[PDB]
């Protein structure tokens, strides 16, 4: 069954095992059943936790339907990959990723009064190289002021910090002026689209380079795993993979009654069906009843 | 695809491009008579402009029937495309079956002969393990869970360091 | 006492504060709490009884919440 | 038996989705 808040995240979802749950719930509602009340409770901590554990049930099956562009030359397979991750994030309830990590920044340091506490509380959500560069810029400003650089914005200590933070930002390759002019907006649309058409080109280069870095990591990991695996003899490979498959099947046969073990065994039987149905007709593929 | 489409019998492909299948249409004003020639079979129907606009009302929605996942099949396709690049340098190994006869056995130093026979045994080991293609489907399930835990973020699945650096420069260089 | 808050006190909020903080002194005690301000707390209050510290704040609540969740997600 | 469907075969198999569901069905009631 579906517990009336799982169905609300799955309407915009498009993976198959969630789409069949939506269609089963709508077939139940067609034959004279009533829709329950959405719970007018669950204060913001439990609400945000339910968001965190309900959007993962859309992200996780939606990741395994996205083919990595491993070993592809060009810029379009990486852009397809990051576009599919964007559409998965938009179907999972996440916002634009720029807006979401900006909200995480403003949520972590809502009450950090100096720039060192902002730069130490969101150390994780920024790269450690850019954070170390901002630490050295902050100590270069504190060497002149000999006071904590106040996180206020109209203080001259923060302005002398910002005039070097923009410098290290353009030194890191990202245009600070374009991003700042986009996120602060503008009045006329004829000059707002001309900064949108530079911010979104930076943004396309940004997620293209990030998805390409993830693809390069998976390529290097697969090359490491294969170049370790090809050194072994055949019998060691066969017995260690049979042992690992047996242990990971015993982990699912140990748990009984739980939903993930039952779905694990149903998926093993579906894999064996796929192998048998390919064996029944190898030039045509698996049998799909249409 | 969207809900409404705006193509059909207007700025259309008037003719085919390759010789494996020959197509011709009749560019009238109201309707069009098509004819398609692909080898031994010949087909020629007659469709209207109001018959192609009914075509994109039902969406096909192609999807991939994979064994485990489309993700796992992509990683396994990459592992097989790497194993092909290892195979293509085991294809350039010099033939040692042409040096097994006893005019090479007895003209050669015994330790160098043991080293040559061990080199042949090592080639048989390497070629029998690079063609263990049933094991790539179990190798590609070791790259999957770390990757899926990376995309299971609290921020966003598509997020990375460059976007976070740009949003940090925006958040830092604003008022407070 | 010493009542460390996040925002300055309002008239109904203050009497609700001395209603909720009265359940810590174990009689009909008249808490003569002092006011302090602390933007670091994200709401709530902190009573400093000068012998004990009662933490009804929000930052302590979300830290105890995150510790409880990070203690339960490892238990399952 | 054979030739199941299409919408049954488009399910990504060894995704987690259920350990996420086994946590979220035992964390959210235990945290309310």
């Amino acid at each position: 069954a579906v517990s009336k808040k799982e169905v609300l995240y799955f309407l915009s979802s498009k993976d198959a095992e969630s789409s069949t749950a939506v269609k089963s719930y709508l077939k139940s509602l067609y034959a004279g059943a009533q829709v329950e009340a959405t719970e007018t409770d669950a204060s913001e901590l439990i609400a945000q936790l339910e968001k965190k554990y309900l959007s993962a049930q859309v992200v996780e099956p939606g990741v395994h339907n996205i083919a990595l562009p491993l070993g592809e030359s060009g810029s379009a397979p990486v852009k397809r990959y990051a576009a599919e991750l964007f559409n998965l994030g938009a179907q999972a309830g996440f916002e634009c990723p720029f807006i979401e990590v900006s909200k995480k920044f403003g949520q972590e340091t809502a009450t950090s009064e100096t720039v060192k506490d902002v730069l130490n509380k969101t150390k994780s959500y920024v790269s450690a190289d850019y954070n170390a560069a901002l630490n050295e810029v902050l100590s270069s400003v504190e060497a002149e002021i000999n006071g904590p650089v106040l996180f206020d914005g109209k203080t001259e200590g923060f302005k002398k910090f910002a005039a070097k933070a923009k410098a290290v930002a353009v030194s890191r390759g990202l245009p600070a002026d374009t991003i700042l002019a986009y996120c602060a907006g503008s009045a006329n649309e004829d000059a707002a689209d001309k900064v949108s058409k530079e911010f979104f080109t930076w943004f396309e280069s940004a997620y293209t380079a990030d998805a390409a870095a993830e693809v390069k990591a998976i390529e290097a990991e697969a090359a490491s795993i294969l170049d370790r695996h090809l050194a072994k003899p055949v019998a060691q490979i066969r017995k260690e993979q049979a042992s690992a498959y047996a242990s990971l099947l015993k982990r699912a046969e140990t748990a009984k009654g739980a939903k993930w073990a039952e779905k694990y065994l149903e998926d093993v039987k579906a894999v064996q069906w796929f192998d048998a149905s390919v064996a029944e007709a190898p030039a045509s593929g698996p049998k799909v009843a249409a | 695809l969207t809900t409404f489409t705006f193509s059909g019998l207007q700025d259309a492909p008037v003719a085919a491009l390759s010789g494996s299948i020959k197509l011709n249409v009749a560019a009238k004003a109201g309707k069009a008579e098509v004819t398609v020639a692909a080898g031994a079979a010949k087909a020629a129907t007659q469709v209207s402009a109001a018959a192609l606009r009914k075509l994109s009302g039902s969406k096909i929605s192609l999807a991939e029937v994979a064994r485990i996942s489309v993700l796992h099949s992509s990683i396994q396709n990459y592992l097989l495309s790497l194993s092909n690049e290892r195979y293509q340098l085991l294809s350039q190994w010099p033939d040692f079956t042409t040096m097994y006869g006893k005019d090479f056995y007895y003209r050669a130093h015994p330790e160098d002969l043991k080293k040559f026979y061990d080199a042949a045994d090592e080639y048989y080991k390497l070629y029998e393990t690079v063609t263990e293609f049933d094991s790539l489907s179990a190798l590609a399930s070791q790259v999957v869970p770390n990757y899926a835990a990376r995309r299971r973020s609290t921020v966003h699945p598509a997020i990375g360091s460059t976007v976070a650096d740009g949003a940090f420069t925006n958040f830092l260089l604003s008022k407070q | 006492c010493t009542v460390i808050t996040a925002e300055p006190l309002d008239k109904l909020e203050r009497v609700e504060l001395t209603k909720k903080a009265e359940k810590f002194v174990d009689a009909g005690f008249k808490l003569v709490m002092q006011e302090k301000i602390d933007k670091k707390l994200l709401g709530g209050f902190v009573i400093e009884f000068s012998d004990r510290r009662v933490d009804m704040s929000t930052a302590k609540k979300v830290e105890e919440f995150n510790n409880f969740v990070n203690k339960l997600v490892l238990s399952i | 038996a054979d030739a199941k469907a299409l919408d049954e075969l488009r399910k990504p198999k060894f995704s987690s989705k259920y350990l996420i569901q086994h946590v979220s069905q035992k964390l959210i009631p235990a945290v309310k």
């Binding site: 965190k52 993962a56 990590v101 994780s124 959500y125 920024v126 790269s127 870095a213 993830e214 390069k216 990591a217 290097a220 990991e221 090359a223 490491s224 294969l226 170049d227 370790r228 090809l230 050194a231 498959y245 990971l248 099947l249 982990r251 993930w260 694990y264 998926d267 093993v268 894999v271 | 485990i68 290892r86 340098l89 085991l90 390497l126 489907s137 179990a138 399930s141 070791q142 999957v144 869970p145 899926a148 835990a149 990376r150 299971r152 973020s153 609290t154 921020v155 997020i159 990375g160 360091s161 976070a164 | 997600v73 399952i76 | 060894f14 987690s16 259920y18 350990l19 996420i20 086994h22 946590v23």
Partner: peptide
Amino acid sequence: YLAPLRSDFTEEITAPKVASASNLVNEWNN
């Protein structure tokens, strides 16, 4: 062919941890 199911999140936005290029092509060429 089957993986250990994990139910955990990544909190930080970190580097993708590019591994080192293993030496199979040089060893097999040697």
